[PDB]
Amino acid sequence: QALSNEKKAKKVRFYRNGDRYFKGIVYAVSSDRFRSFDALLADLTRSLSDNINLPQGVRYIYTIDGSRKIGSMDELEEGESYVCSSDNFFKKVEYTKNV
Amino acid sequence: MREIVHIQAGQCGNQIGAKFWEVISDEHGIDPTGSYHGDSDLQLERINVYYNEAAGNKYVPRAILVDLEPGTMDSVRSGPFGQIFRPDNFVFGQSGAGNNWAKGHYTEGAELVDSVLDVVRKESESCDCLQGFQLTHSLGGGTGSGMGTLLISKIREEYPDRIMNTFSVVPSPKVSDTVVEPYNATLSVHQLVENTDETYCIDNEALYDICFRTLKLTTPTYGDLNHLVSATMSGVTTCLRFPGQLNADLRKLAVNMVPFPRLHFFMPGFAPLTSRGSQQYRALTVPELTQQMFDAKNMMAACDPRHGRYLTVAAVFRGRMSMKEVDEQMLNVQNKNSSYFVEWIPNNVKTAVCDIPPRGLKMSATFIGNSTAIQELFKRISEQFTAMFRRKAFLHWYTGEGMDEMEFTEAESNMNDLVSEYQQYQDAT
Amino acid sequence: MREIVHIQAGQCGNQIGAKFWEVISDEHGIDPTGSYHGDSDLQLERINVYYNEAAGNKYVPRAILVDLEPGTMDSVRSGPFGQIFRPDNFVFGQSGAGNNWAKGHYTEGAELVDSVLDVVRKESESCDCLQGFQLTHSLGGGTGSGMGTLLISKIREEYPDRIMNTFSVVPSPKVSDTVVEPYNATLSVHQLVENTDETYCIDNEALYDICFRTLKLTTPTYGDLNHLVSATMSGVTTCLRFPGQLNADLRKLAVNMVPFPRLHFFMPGFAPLTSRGSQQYRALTVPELTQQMFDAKNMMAACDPRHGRYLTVAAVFRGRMSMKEVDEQMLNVQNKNSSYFVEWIPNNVKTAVCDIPPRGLKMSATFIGNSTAIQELFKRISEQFTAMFRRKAFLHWYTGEGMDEMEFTEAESNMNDLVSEYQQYQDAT
Ligand SMILES: Nc1nc2c(ncn2[C@@H]2O[C@H](COP(=O)(O)OP(=O)(O)O)[C@@H](O)[C@H]2O)c(=O)[nH]1
Ligand SMILES: Nc1nc2c(ncn2[C@@H]2O[C@H](COP(=O)(O)OP(=O)(O)O)[C@@H](O)[C@H]2O)c(=O)[nH]1
């Protein structure tokens, strides 16, 4: 067979912690672009913090609710937004309002 | 009043624009420094349409230059008339398109469009009464097709009444500069039919023939091909920058050429085009300009107009000439060629006469013609699209950027909904 | 009349002041010797506000310089415009701060403040009619935060009606010059909210962005960062030193900007700021100065004003300009941006127009804006304070200088009584 295994990109959204005025850039999360979960955090470094957020950078990704620390990329899913934090302390504001 | 904001995109959109601002500066008399060296006061009367007066009697263009790699912006600022652009307008990214529509419209287009629109909004709030935009891009590449159609979808949400015309470069039928150019053209016409007001389809192959058959040039480089497109771009708005006898603009052509809001793909044409040693064996009269426009060897799209029917025809004349002599030649080519025009539109020729010629000639014309002979142009994109899509080849470079097959299916179905309209109104009664 | 006594403190307060007196001397035309080399008689009319005429037509500054080690005073007297200060004003101790608030306000602050106030009282009894003081310090270090707030608590007991404005340097959010800078800032805002009248919050991080994004400087040293602060300090009192059309001073801004006696933390802004090669691609008009002040990339505190609401806005214009052109641009940015201003204060823009520009430009502005977007500035100090205090780390360097935990608890409770006011008046009706 030549029509291969459908290398697909998840369309996920990444809000940043605390900043209420942010929308979240849709990334091409795929198994072709990131071999490890630790390689996904490296792209989150430059494209989230520009001038004012995240002194510790990108460490701990939380759910949109959020109550589960995200493990590997197989813990992710297709079409759900996420909040990107950098501490054990989670700020509970309304992220997904007014997308 | 009536200002125009110029937007460029991609490698091809820069090198048309870098030649376009060399022609506009020679009509208004602008040095490469940015000062003024004119002789008559008619050049400074309507200078505000393409220029903002800076401090110290310098005029800078109202241009916005977009690319995804700095390789082409480095040649624009270093060439002639490259010191005239403002350094803030050079908006460029570091990644690069990769000759890819998905990297131009979804991934790297979204990281740049929020920085481009900070420049579009700043220039639009500085003009007194905005006429409308214009865009120069190409349907073959990645930046001019992905980033170029992304800017139109964001502008039309903000300015729903200003006109928006694009000078696209439709890919040639015989040779192919890009392997995936059917994908980059099918996924771009689907954006242009819902977000523009008029569109100028230009083929490269029809420009190589004019430099070989009409102008008789030995070695035509792109300085000689893009000089013909820049003469046509200035020839549309030339009744807006100078006083005339029968005036037109970018709004009167958008009314008189577009009868249905989906049929707005044109084909351009310039006249006169003389050779280097044959410009003395010719009289420059109005019946010479007329019979050089309407023949098939002077169009700029690779399609013979004899295969179809003209819906609407615009002819923008320049220079001092008798109005009786113009109103008779347009009538005479409509009575004897009564089959190649359409029946359900009587008197389908629009006339516009300016007063000031281009620099060097005595009188000149510009042909802006709509036709159903461009249905041959969309059969060849749709045939080459379905030849590549049915094997689903070159698809994992698109699906891997967050895209599904339904994006392609609604794109090709829209194009066959466009071909079934040009075939429908060709055989009316 | 209306004299101003200038007080400096710490390492940072000297190197702002040593650049500040270089800008004032160039506006009034003073050599580094101390003589006068002006051309017009407007420079000597109001010379008494920052200068005392010495014997022999020499003018010396009314400056009082405070430090705890002689290491920074040695560079001030040896640099340019360092021979102009009187040698008695260099009040310095031998111990040193140790980058410590308790050594700056309790132990070594008390051994020096009785010698500093012998110089403050001598300069205040020599002026005819005192307008008010001013102070340049920094909230990060020890001398500018401990000795700096100790001087304000002693002055306010002696001069309860004169104004007192401080040009503080609030520490940046991302990088940290001092490990214990949350302690040195929390224990200083508790002193400033009860003893000052208006306070200019300046972040270092917002000044590195202007030298990188706006002015396009390759290697900005502190001679290039402190030159922007000294232009803003002179731009507030510039309607007091020169005749104008609509005059202001340090009292009219203290009335029109401060609606409640606890809400007096500002954010400054200067305009125009051109690059080195982009100061010819720009017209210097009033609608260019207006749309360069109000955007977020020209503030001097690291906080976007879009997160909150402006309570009061002052704009001090300099140079000859039409008053109709100023009164329309301030109105236009208030009608279209009607959400980012506050509702229960109508017409919240204060205008002041001087006549004499800065040396080199043709016209200039200065933005003095109050906002509730500085509640983000006090959340980050209060979060970093409670992160360090709940483990009681770096505390034995403070308790060992005669201090208890109740000094910290009433300091952090005062700051959360300040955050609950900016959140309260942001959502009024
Ligand atoms: N007329 C003309 N077409 C050009 C020129 N340079 C490139 N092109 C066209 O541009 C297309 C290639 O795409 P490209 O310019 O690289 O755009 P991008 O890949 O989106 O940046 C082809 O159709 C070329 O014929 C030029 O100087 N003149
Ligand atoms: N803008 C500016 N800030 C400075 C300069 N020198 C030091 N600082 C700031 O001063 C603080 C360090 O404290 P310091 O000046 O030593 O004060 P002290 O310890 O009380 O004597 C930090 O916030 C620095 O950013 C300068 O030349 N310019």
Author numbering:
A (entry chain N): 44 to 142
B (entry chain B), C (entry chain b): 1 to 429
From the primary publication:
One hour polymerization produced 13‐PF GDP‐MTs. Strikingly, the DC domain density in the rapidly polymerized WT‐MT reconstruction most resembles CDC, while the corresponding density in the 1 h MT reconstruction resembles NDC. An additional difference between the 30 s and 1 h reconstructions is that a short peptide corresponding to the sequence that precedes the DC domain is visible in the 1 h MT reconstruction, but not in the rapidly polymerized WT‐MT reconstruction. We therefore assigned this density to the N‐terminal flanking region of NDC and modeled it accordingly. Comparison of the reconstruction of the NN‐MTs—which can only have NDC bound to the MT—with the WT‐MT reconstructions confirms that the 1 h WT‐MT lattice is predominantly bound by NDC. In 1 h WT‐MTs, additional interactions are mediated by the N‐terminal flanking region of NDC (residues 44–50). The longer Loop 3 of NDC is inserted in the inter‐PF grove, where it more closely follows the shape of the MT wall than the shorter Loop 3 of CDC. This endows NDC with an additional polar contact via N94 with β‐tubulin's D209 and a hydrophobic contact via I95 with β‐tubulin's A302. Altogether, CDC forms 9 and NDC forms 11 ionic interactions with MT lattice, which suggests higher affinity of NDC for MT lattice compared to CDC. On the other hand, NDC shows structural rigidity regardless of the architecture of the MT to which it is bound, and this MT‐bound conformation is highly similar to the published NMR and X‐ray structures of NDC (cyan, RMSD = 1.3 Å).
Doublecortin (DCX) is a neuronal microtubule‐associated protein (MAP) indispensable for brain development. It contains two homologous globular doublecortin (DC) domains—NDC and CDC—connected by a 40‐residue unstructured linker (Kim et al, 2003; Cierpicki et al, 2006), followed by a disordered C‐terminal serine/proline‐rich domain. It recognizes a corner between four tubulin dimers via a DC domain, except at the seam (Fourniol et al, 2010). Although coupled, each DC repeat within DCX appears to have a distinct role in MT nucleation and stabilization: CDC is a conformationally plastic module that appears to facilitate MT nucleation and stabilize tubulin–tubulin contacts in the nascent MT lattice, while NDC appears to be favored along the mature lattice, providing MT stabilization.
